[PDB]
Amino acid sequence: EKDFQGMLEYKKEDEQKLVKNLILELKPRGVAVNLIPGLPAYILFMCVRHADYLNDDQKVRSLLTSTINSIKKVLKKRGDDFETVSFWLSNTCRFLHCLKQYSGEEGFMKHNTSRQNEHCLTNFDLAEYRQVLSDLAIQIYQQLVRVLENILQPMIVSGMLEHETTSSIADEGTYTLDSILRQLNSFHSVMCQHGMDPELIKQVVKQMFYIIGAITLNNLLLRKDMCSWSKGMQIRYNVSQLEEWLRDKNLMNSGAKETLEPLIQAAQLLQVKKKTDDDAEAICSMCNALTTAQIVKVLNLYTPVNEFEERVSVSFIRTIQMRLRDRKDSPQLLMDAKHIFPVTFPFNPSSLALETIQIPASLGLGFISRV
């Protein structure tokens, strides 16, 4: 054999049971729903396809509205669980990719098989609905960043600055760099299981690294004891382990390492010579990712390793301030650790043949009929 159309039919009276079982009560780590990443998106789109086929615009509207409202309900109740937020970000994006891929617009059909093009919508242009879904995905992404940030925040200063250096969860209760890496591993494995777009995973990871670098640099500038040659070495080692993690995950082109540039330059600043005019010119050339206020703070805080090393002189600091005078610089000392880089959801068509997709019987959607 039978050649299915790749659509799903349901009765209007069952629409609320549909979103109840497909959205409200769906477990994000359930086996059945994770056999095919994005399965709820594919199911919803196949339901949209049959509503379009029936020439029923009110049914399309009702299904989309119930879908969007149900996803918001889930995230209001469980929005502090990163697995749930990852899951609906991923499925919201996949639903949007489906609506594009099967829109009938030629720009979105370049990777389509001949069979896939047979599955485009025929009666309705759903561009307005794609905008609403895009807006929803932006909101979910913003919630994802906040949940991940909340999880990492308690680990970052201990792991990056305080603690000195198979993995352990902690060192006698203390968060270490290894704690941070385990947490990043968890995040990444869940996003992958959910089928999150690789370009979106890259953006999440870039955002997380930004937060790590911002919180670390700010606490270096706010404490009195973190500006030393030795701490410079420690930060260098920790950054190199974060870089190795990116390598392990094939994310070295995510832009994540580059968000650490202010912290990286602060660590370098701790380790250069700080006496002559050549030393001063080098600092000014080197520290393009640090504000003048930040450079001056580090130099003031800098602690000699022992008696054979001196503090930075006040006249040296003045020389750098003079050199950086015509910098149209921000007067701020602290990085904005709450900055979120604007997210994008580039089109990611899928190879999945709709006419082959089977609903797992355990999801309790037996009232849906395969067309």
């Binding site: 615009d57 509207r61 509205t65 409202n69 918001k72 009666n123 242009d125 307005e128 609905y129």
Partner: peptide, 17 residues
């Protein structure tokens, strides 16, 4: 066949009821 551009409630509008 022409595809008619449907009017979608905005995300905000849906947030009502």
């Amino acid at each position: 066949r022409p595809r008619v551009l449907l009017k979608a409630p905005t995300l905000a509008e849906m947030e009502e009821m």
